[PDB]
Amino acid sequence: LAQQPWVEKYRPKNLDEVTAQDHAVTVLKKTLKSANLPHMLFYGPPGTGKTSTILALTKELYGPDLMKSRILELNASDERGISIVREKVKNFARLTVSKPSKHDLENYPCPPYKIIILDEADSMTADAQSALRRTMETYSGVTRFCLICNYVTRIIDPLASRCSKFRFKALDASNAIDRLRFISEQENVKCDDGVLERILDISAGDLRRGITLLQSASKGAQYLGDGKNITSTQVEELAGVVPHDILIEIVEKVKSGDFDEIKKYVNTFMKSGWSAASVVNQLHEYYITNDNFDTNFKNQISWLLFTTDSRLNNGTNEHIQLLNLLVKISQL
Amino acid sequence: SLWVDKYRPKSLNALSHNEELTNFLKSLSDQPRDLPHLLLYGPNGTGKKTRCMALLESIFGPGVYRLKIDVRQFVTASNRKLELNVVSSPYHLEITPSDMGNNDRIVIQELLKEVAQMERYKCVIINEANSLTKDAQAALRRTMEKYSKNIRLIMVCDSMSPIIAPIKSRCLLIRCPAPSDSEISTILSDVVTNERIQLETKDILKRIAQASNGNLRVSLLMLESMALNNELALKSSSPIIKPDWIIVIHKLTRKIVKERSVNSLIECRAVLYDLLAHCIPANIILKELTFSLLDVETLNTTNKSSIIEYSSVFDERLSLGNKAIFHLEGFIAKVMCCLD
Amino acid sequence: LPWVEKYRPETLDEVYGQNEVITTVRKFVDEGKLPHLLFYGPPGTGKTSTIVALAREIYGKNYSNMVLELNASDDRGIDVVRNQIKDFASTRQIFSKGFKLIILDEADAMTNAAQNALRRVIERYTKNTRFCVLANYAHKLTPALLSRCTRFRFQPLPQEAIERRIANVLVHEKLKLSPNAEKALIELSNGDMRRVLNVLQSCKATLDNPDEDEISDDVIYECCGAPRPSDLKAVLKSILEDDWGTAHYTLNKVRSAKGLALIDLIEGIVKILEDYELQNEETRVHLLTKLADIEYSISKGGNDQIQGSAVIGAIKASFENE
Amino acid sequence: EKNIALKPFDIAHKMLDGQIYSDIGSRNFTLNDKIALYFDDFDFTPLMIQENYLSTRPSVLKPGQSHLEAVAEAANCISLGDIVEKKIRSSEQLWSLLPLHAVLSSVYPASKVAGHMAGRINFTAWLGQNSKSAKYYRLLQEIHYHTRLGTSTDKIGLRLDYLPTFRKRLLDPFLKQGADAISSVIEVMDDYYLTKEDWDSIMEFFVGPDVTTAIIKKIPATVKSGFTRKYNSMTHPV
Amino acid sequence: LSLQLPWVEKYRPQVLSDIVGNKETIDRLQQIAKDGNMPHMIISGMPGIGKTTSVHCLAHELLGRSYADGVLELNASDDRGIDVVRNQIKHFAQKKLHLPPGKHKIVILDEADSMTAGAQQALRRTMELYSNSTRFAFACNQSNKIIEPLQSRCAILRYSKLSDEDVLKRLLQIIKLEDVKYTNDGLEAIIFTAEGDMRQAINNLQSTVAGHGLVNADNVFKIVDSPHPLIVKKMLLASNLEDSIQILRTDLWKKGYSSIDIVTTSFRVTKNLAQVKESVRLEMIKEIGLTHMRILEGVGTYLQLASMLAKIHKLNNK
Ligand SMILES: Nc1nc2c(ncn2[C@@H]2O[C@H](COP(=O)(O)OP(=O)(O)O)[C@@H](O)[C@H]2O)c(=O)[nH]1
Numbered sequence A: 001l002a003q004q005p006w007v008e009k010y011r012p013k014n015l016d017e018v019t020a021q022d023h024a025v026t027v028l029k030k031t032l033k034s035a036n037l038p039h040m041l042f043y044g045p046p047g048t049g050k051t052s053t054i055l056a057l058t059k060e061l062y063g064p065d066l067m068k069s070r071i072l073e074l075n076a077s078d079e080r081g082i083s084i085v086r087e088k089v090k091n092f093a094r095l096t097v098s099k100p101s102k103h104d105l106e107n108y109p110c111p112p113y114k115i116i117i118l119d120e121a122d123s124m125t126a127d128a129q130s131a132l133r134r135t136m137e138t139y140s141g142v143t144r145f146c147l148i149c150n151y152v153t154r155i156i157d158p159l160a161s162r163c164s165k166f167r168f169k170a171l172d173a174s175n176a177i178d179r180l181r182f183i184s185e186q187e188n189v190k191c192d193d194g195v196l197e198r199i200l201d202i203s204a205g206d207l208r209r210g211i212t213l214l215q216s217a218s219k220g221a222q223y224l225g226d227g228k229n230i231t232s233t234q235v236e237e238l239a240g241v242v243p244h245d246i247l248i249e250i251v252e253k254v255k256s257g258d259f260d261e262i263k264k265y266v267n268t269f270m271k272s273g274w275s276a277a278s279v280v281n282q283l284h285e286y287y288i289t290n291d292n293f294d295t296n297f298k299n300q301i302s303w304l305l306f307t308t309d310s311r312l313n314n315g316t317n318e319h320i321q322l323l324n325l326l327v328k329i330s331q332l
Numbered sequence B: 001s002l003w004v005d006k007y008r009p010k011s012l013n014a015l016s017h018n019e020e021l022t023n024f025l026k027s028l029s030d031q032p033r034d035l036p037h038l039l040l041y042g043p044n045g046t047g048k049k050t051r052c053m054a055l056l057e058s059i060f061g062p063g064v065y066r067l068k069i070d071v072r073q074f075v076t077a078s079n080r081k082l083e084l085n086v087v088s089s090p091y092h093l094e095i096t097p098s099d100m101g102n103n104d105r106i107v108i109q110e111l112l113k114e115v116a117q118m119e120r121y122k123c124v125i126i127n128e129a130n131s132l133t134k135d136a137q138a139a140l141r142r143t144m145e146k147y148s149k150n151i152r153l154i155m156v157c158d159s160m161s162p163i164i165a166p167i168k169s170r171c172l173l174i175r176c177p178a179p180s181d182s183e184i185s186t187i188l189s190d191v192v193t194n195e196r197i198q199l200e201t202k203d204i205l206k207r208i209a210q211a212s213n214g215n216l217r218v219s220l221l222m223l224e225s226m227a228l229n230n231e232l233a234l235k236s237s238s239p240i241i242k243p244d245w246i247i248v249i250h251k252l253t254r255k256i257v258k259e260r261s262v263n264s265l266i267e268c269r270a271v272l273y274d275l276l277a278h279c280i281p282a283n284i285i286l287k288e289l290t291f292s293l294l295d296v297e298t299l300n301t302t303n304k305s306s307i308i309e310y311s312s313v314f315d316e317r318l319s320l321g322n323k324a325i326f327h328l329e330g331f332i333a334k335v336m337c338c339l340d
Numbered sequence C: 001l002p003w004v005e006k007y008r009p010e011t012l013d014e015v016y017g018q019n020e021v022i023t024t025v026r027k028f029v030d031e032g033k034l035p036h037l038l039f040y041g042p043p044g045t046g047k048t049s050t051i052v053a054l055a056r057e058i059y060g061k062n063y064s065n066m067v068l069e070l071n072a073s074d075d076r077g078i079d080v081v082r083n084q085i086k087d088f089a090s091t092r093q094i095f096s097k098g099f100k101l102i103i104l105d106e107a108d109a110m111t112n113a114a115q116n117a118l119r120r121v122i123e124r125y126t127k128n129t130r131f132c133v134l135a136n137y138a139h140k141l142t143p144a145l146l147s148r149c150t151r152f153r154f155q156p157l158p159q160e161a162i163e164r165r166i167a168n169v170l171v172h173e174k175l176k177l178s179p180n181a182e183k184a185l186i187e188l189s190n191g192d193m194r195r196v197l198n199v200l201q202s203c204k205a206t207l208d209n210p211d212e213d214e215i216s217d218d219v220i221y222e223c224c225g226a227p228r229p230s231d232l233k234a235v236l237k238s239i240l241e242d243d244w245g246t247a248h249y250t251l252n253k254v255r256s257a258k259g260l261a262l263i264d265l266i267e268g269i270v271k272i273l274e275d276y277e278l279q280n281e282e283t284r285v286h287l288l289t290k291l292a293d294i295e296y297s298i299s300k301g302g303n304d305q306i307q308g309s310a311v312i313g314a315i316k317a318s319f320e321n322e
Numbered sequence D: 001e002k003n004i005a006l007k008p009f010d011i012a013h014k015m016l017d018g019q020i021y022s023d024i025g026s027r028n029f030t031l032n033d034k035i036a037l038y039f040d041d042f043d044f045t046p047l048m049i050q051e052n053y054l055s056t057r058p059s060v061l062k063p064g065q066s067h068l069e070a071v072a073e074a075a076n077c078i079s080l081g082d083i084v085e086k087k088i089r090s091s092e093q094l095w096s097l098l099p100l101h102a103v104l105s106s107v108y109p110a111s112k113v114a115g116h117m118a119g120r121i122n123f124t125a126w127l128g129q130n131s132k133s134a135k136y137y138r139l140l141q142e143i144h145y146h147t148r149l150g151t152s153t154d155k156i157g158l159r160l161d162y163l164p165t166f167r168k169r170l171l172d173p174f175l176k177q178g179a180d181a182i183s184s185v186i187e188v189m190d191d192y193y194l195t196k197e198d199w200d201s202i203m204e205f206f207v208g209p210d211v212t213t214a215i216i217k218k219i220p221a222t223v224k225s226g227f228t229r230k231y232n233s234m235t236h237p238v
Numbered sequence E: 001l002s003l004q005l006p007w008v009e010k011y012r013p014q015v016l017s018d019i020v021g022n023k024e025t026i027d028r029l030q031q032i033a034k035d036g037n038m039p040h041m042i043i044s045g046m047p048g049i050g051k052t053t054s055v056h057c058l059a060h061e062l063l064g065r066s067y068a069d070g071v072l073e074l075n076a077s078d079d080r081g082i083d084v085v086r087n088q089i090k091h092f093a094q095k096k097l098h099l100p101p102g103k104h105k106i107v108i109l110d111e112a113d114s115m116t117a118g119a120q121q122a123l124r125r126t127m128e129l130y131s132n133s134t135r136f137a138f139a140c141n142q143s144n145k146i147i148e149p150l151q152s153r154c155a156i157l158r159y160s161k162l163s164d165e166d167v168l169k170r171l172l173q174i175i176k177l178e179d180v181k182y183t184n185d186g187l188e189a190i191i192f193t194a195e196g197d198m199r200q201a202i203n204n205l206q207s208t209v210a211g212h213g214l215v216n217a218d219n220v221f222k223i224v225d226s227p228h229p230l231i232v233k234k235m236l237l238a239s240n241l242e243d244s245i246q247i248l249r250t251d252l253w254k255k256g257y258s259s260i261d262i263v264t265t266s267f268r269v270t271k272n273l274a275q276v277k278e279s280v281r282l283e284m285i286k287e288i289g290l291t292h293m294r295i296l297e298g299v300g301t302y303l304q305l306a307s308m309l310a311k312i313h314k315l316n317n318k
């Protein structure tokens, strides 16, 4: 069968199908009306439609047939280094521009340049971005770049000045939940009440991760029999999220403050295979946004959680770090 | 052979604990063509590798168990010679790229591609996926995207935290919790009934489970050792047999608690040197020492809190260092100061 | 027509100062003790002008034959530039007896292996070839390359000279700039004329009427992709005055909607807090130590939300000492 | 020639002398001199300091401070210096941090526990222990390669869990059955493709109460001869 | 016009007696040159201390007129390829240039520690094949990274950083040979700036002589590109944290000095703060080194320097 990820399957086809990004779409339409397309810097929260909008703009610029030969999509974050990305861009630019057919010319403007799209450009180092700017300057005659990122401030000033910047607003909860519901209804995914909201909460509003998690949940639901509805426990299991009941038990054990009880509970918890990093993240979310703790407690617990997360990021023993964090919180 | 290996389940029907996971694996094997990439994460000695092999047997057949071993040499930039021990079969491959240190990426890219060239598909089982470098994980994501037609990856790890998000998105996460003490007792009872081992009461098996901390492999090996010592007749008074290094570490804990001085630290250094020289990992030594210290009944809450804090600090230092004896001695000295 | 190439200092008169480098190199040439030079500093200080003036003084009418000007950031390759250096060194002329100068602009962008190969080439051809290396930062070069080159630091331009050059550019290009925008541009460029010219050109391009419109500070900050001081001040005020929930919500909302990285937000908050009048030294000690720790942890990855809450907690705890 | 090997001993003895850490002694032997002492044979100075910093009687103890606290602080600094050394000698090649590693590994811990050498300056034991650990890890790798097709474990799991039971199945039967257990021992070895060299190597991995040197020596030579003869008299799986 | 001969190149050591530091290693090399029959050797030490220069001087002493073609220097990490440099080594070694019976052809390899085990084994085989005429010297930073078969065949020499006395002696020799007017404080400043770096010290001396003629502290510090030690001392010893931060902002950060130079000068100044007790100096050095390590890991911001100053002030006030 023609298996395809739902993220790339449900991308909007034209600029008119972008829902919430009115400002960016309007500015892009105005720029497209002009005969000149400058270098573009798409920035905003993840899963807002940056790649979808640039792909729709490309499709309207070239056409469904020519756009695939006129597009170079790269991910500088996932690549080995600067050399591979820059060599691929150089080879794409030096390659002869594909000649548009009669239908493409008579139906679409077909500008004489090709578009290079970079994903996660802000993850690049300063030297990598300077090299990218030099490469863009060298081949600026026949290629227009589009840098997709979450933080415009992570891009150096020389590279950012050359690009017209488009800010994408974070998607509203209603819009994201409606998109997820439409995708689920089109794919005949039976979801219980609150499952889509749980998926969005786990993804932290990232519609890309939400769609990926929904597809994974559907795939898991096919394996299980009886055709039962997908439940929040299944999507929590698939995303590696500790259940809320275990978190409440951890909080109660910390509140009681007994060292031996906390040690026993952490020992019996490390046997269940739950990720310690997920526990730390959920404890941070629970404690920081809780109205039952005063300012001093949160001031101390923020530093405690920061230290525990920093030590966990170094590839240490989860059991020791989790026990130390829980004991330190219980001593507050 | 040892009872841990002789009675290992060789099929999905022979699995006895974690029935939900067994049903899930059966459902997965019911549709071999659309098999997703899998990442099985859980505590050590819980049956992850056994379940992976059982799933492979369900998909292909018993021929996956006719395993061969071969050393493969890889040519790399700088003209270095790297040898990888591939446990191969006429249906699947097993690799542990972490044994190649930081070269694992160039080991993977050279190997997986070759497999895709040699091919419905050939499964590859990557052990210790959590200890792979980030570049190796990026190469693994690249091979997953490029060769999803002929390559299906089954990664096994004890913690999914070091795994990167791009791998997690494209793989099916499978959580393998450690078996409960009742299931361990049932498995040991089946083993002893198969081996005709006398039991004064079943409670002994329960104790063995409580001694293994959910580690099924450790529980089975402990049961075999206890049976061998007690002339194939386990009594209620039969002592629990612990490994040599665990006994040494417990003796070290008792020594540290009893006497806190510079000479005691000097002798703890010799004990640690022996343990490290006989292939006991530093992180294992630190974890066992910390959790033996926390179990001493004469220490108050303040002492235990200081001990666990120092354990966390020196665990980070061990993960960021080279010479392990330095960090172990520092931790022991700090604990001695705290107790005194 | 880039504005960096235009208005470039072509003579020593255009250079504000730094005649000491010229005099020292002139004495080196006169005494026959000219070493491999390494001019490093911010762009536009006059490194290229100084070296070309020295080359013209040394040679004169045969400048094009005794001088090889190369740019290490042309990205042609290591082998091609090595071949160019070798064929320039091997082409000796009887009527043009003397050492041959090789200028290498923007050498700090090279990889470490390329720098080591360049150092080996420099050692190989030191008998008849002298190397001048131009760099923005000397610390980016390998120690082996640094040790073989006599270092000359070009000090950043004074603010008065930068303002005079900006006024000259504005009157040349008929551009009107607000004083706040001028201050923001000067602060962002950090004494780099190339950044000033590029940002001014881009802002002029983005204007709907580049002849009858004045560039504001908001336009400058948008063009440079830098955090606006108003946003950082709002975040700091929310952290200092509002409770934990409001501070957390405000920080996350501002740094996600405006696309400000946590490290850049930390840097801006530190810069703002420099001007605060604190009654206790321990407040500043705690602030600096905790914020540096958080930034160092951010550099290694980690949890983003946890680090943001750590920043909020660090500031709140430090300001409890008044 | 022997002065080359004697130099680290002299450096360690001088750096642990408390007189150069007093107020008067600091002026005569400043911090630059101590860092220079480190930079003379910088390969061995951190190792010698880590080896000998527990054998001193401190004369620089602060009031209210015991010897144990001083050695704990010295050990903390030594581990920090080890981390710095790892970062220095990695592929990053951060040799500019050598002076810092001078203070973290040698000078500061010496300052914490400086005094009179209570005994003799002993050479660092870390090199021999590291070589021994490498040899035993190679032996464990060979054993794991031999037994991988029969055991479902990694190398570390083989050492920690399987080897104690392999001891009971390969050495214990001899003590209680004389030469009558040779057939069973050979059968167990054949079930895991274990050679006689592997049998010899396995018994060397045990520590504490499980040491097998004296136990193996106590086994009669006739039993060992019969075991090796029976092993050499039959073919084995490979 | 004429030929350009910089002091760093003119006064580089040619004979073995021109080397100042490493008295034991230099004595061993002098004995080897005196008795002839140079054995295969491995010289190990931190990079940048001129390890290869000593064996070059030994080769000059052994061969002399035949040095121009009887010595092959190569880099193990050459970008051209390990295979091509190994082939060059073999081709040079199999040649049979006429040499006196008491002397042998010499091959010097730099950065030999980065070679893989197979390449090292091949080099050992090549050395053994042509051991009758060609001898090998391997320069490395870490001696442990050289395989045991190579280590056993060679004699190990260890090279250490030059002390301030050696740098002072070399500078005095250069000054006497160049009739340079100087002062004691100027030489002290030059030695202070270059921590055992002979090449940097000679370059700074030449630049100071050209720029001003008389070598004193003021002229040396004007020539030297590092931050002025007096400014860093004022920043470190300031009794108020605001004063230290203001000095850092105005005089060091805004003056274009990189964070690496700032921390290096802070380390150098803190080593020599005789007015402060050595325990406080060690604590300050530990903090400075921690921030230096953070900078070298890629942070290198102004906030790190501000935190370093805050910690130093906290230590100072006790
Ligand atoms: N009887 C029985 N034994 C099991 C089961 N699961 C695991 N084991 C035993 O557990 C031992 C170790 O499992 P292992 O493959 O090492 O799992 P892993 O190391 O955690 O990935 C095996 O030797 C099995 O004998 C089960 O369902 N039934």
Ligand SMILES: Nc1ncnc2c1ncn2[C@@H]1O[C@H](COP(=O)(O)OP(=O)(O)O)[C@@H](O)[C@H]1O
Pocket: A006, A007, A008, A009, A010, A011, A012, A017, A018, A019, A020, A021, A045, A046, A047, A048, A049, A050, A051, A052, A053, A148, A179, A207, A208, A211
């Ligand atoms: N405005 C939008 N309307 C509808 N769907 C959207 C919108 N923005 C994002 N999506 C969904 O997000 C998915 C891809 O997200 P993407 O644009 O790649 O995220 P990012 O903005 O990080 O590039 C698509 O499947 C698409 O359905």
